[PDB]
Write a protein that binds this ligand. Structure first.
Ligand SMILES: Nc1ncnc2c1ncn2[C@@H]1O[C@H](COP(=O)(O)OP(=O)(O)OP(=O)(O)O)[C@@H](O)[C@H]1O
Ligand SMILES: Cc1oncc1/C(O)=C(\C#N)C(=O)Nc1ccc(S(=O)(=O)c2ccc(Cl)cc2)cc1
Ligand SMILES: [Mg+2]
Ligand SMILES: [Mg+2]
Ligand SMILES: [Zn+2]
Length: 355
């Protein structure tokens, strides 16, 4: 109620910073797209705006933007890596502009990402000050910082207008919330592959790509009610986005405060985003997200997240057999540690949110 509302007030974005940040991002992104379009291998590149800024659930400051530099790849053939469900080798069906990145029959993610990064790096010294952050192992992101303030994650994304892979067949369980009609329309849209490599023991399988549905996530968050007029008038202001923002802030704050021994380094905002989509599936009616019930609605979000930690299971919303909380990705000790901290917070009405 009052405490949660006070937090949300604190997390609001300034209309001014949104405006200035937008222009800075546009300038940088427009430059890089222009350069990339010169290269024969990136001719068809195009922009897709994704993540929390464009979903209107960015908190505190508009200082982190996410964009896909998408590139259509006709006639694409996938081989699932190691029954991982989310990671794939990319092949082609019988002049391919991507010829140069092939290793045997296979398009190398690492080869193609490296050139992508190169060109952008090579272009970053040309009206604003932009610096490129260190490459994170196995990440799809090329991360820039503008004016020592605004981070922009750029991922290359292959775009396939084929039907989604078989691994997604039982995902996107929105039928009871957003409708069967909408699920069908959504699954007619493209899917993306980004050069995030599957973990291989201590390293990465460096030719693998991973599915991305960032475009669908954005569409859902910006058209998120059972009612088509959800959040379009003062009588239908649900608390869905408020609950996602609080879950994000809860995790951010816990990560900050536990930074001395880095217990929570393996947890990310996408974990709480995923958990939140599952709670939307469980609670499909707008009446289950009434502004008057902010407290209860947030609790529903927290207790589902707690269940996910304790069962060490958090299914990718689109790929059910991809477990974001597997031992492969996050060790048991870390999940047990966050479980305890979230329980403490829940049991004491979130002291971490006190001013
Ligand atoms: N592990 C992942 N699997 C699939 N998609 C992911 C994953 N991590 C991030 N993404 C996609 O990348 C987008 C941007 O990621 P990012 O970490 O910037 O989070 P965000 O949703 O923008 O939230 P915020 O940036 O406020 O923490 C996500 O919204 C999601 O669509
Ligand atoms: C841009 C961008 O624009 N649209 C989407 C998108 C994007 O960032 C992704 C997509 N799709 C995407 O998958 N990101 C992504 C980035 C990093 C990593 S990690 O494994 O390095 C990592 C694990 C845990 C932690 Cl705590 C921190 C890092 C995994 C995925
Ligand atoms: Mg982001
Ligand atoms: Mg990001
Ligand atoms: Zn709403």
């Amino acid at each position: 109620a009052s405490k949660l509302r006070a937090v949300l007030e604190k997390l609001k974005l300034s209309r001014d910073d949104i405006s200035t940040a937008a222009g800075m991002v546009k300038g940088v992104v427009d430059h890089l797209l222009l350069r990339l379009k010169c290269d024969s291998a990136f001719r068809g590149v195009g922009l897709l705006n994704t993540g929390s800024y464009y979903e209107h659930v960015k908190i505190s400051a508009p200082n982190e933007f996410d964009v896909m530099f998408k590139l259509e790849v006709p006639r694409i053939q996938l081989e699932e890596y190691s029954n991982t469900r989310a990671y794939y080798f990319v092949k082609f069906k019988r002049e391919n502009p991507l010829s140069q990145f092939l290793e045997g029959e296979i398009l190398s993610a690492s080869k193609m990402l490296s050139k992508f990064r190169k060109i952008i790096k090579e272009e970053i010294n040309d009206d604003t000050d932009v610096i490129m952050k260190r490459k994170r192992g196995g990440s799809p992101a090329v991360t820039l910082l503008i004016s020592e303030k605004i981070s922009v994650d750029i991922t290359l994304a292959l775009e396939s207008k084929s039907s989604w892979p078989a691994s997604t067949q039982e995902g996107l369980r929105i039928q009871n919330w957003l409708s069967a009609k909408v699920r069908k329309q959504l699954r007619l849209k493209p899917f993306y592959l980004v050069p995030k490599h599957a973990k291989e023991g201590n390293g990465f399988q460096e030719e693998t790509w991973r599915l991305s549905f960032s475009h669908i996530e954005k569409e859902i968050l910006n058209n998120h009610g059972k009612s088509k007029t959800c959040c379009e008038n003062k009588e239908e202001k649900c608390c869905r986005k408020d609950c996602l923002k609080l879950m994000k802030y809860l995790l951010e704050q816990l990560k900050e405060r536990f930074k001395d021994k880095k217990h929570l380094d393996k947890f990310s905002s996408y974990h709480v985003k995923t958990a939140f989509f599952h709670v939307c599936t469980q609670n499909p009616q707008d009446s289950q997200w009434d502004r008057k019930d902010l407290g209860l609605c947030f609790d529903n979000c927290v207790t589902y997240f707690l269940q996910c930690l304790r069962t060490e299971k958090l299914e990718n919303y689109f790929i059910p057999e991809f477990n974001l909380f597997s031992s492969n990705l996050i060790d048991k000790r870390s999940k047990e540690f966050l479980t305890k901290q979230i329980e403490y917070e829940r049991n004491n009405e979130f002291p971490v949110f006190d001013e």
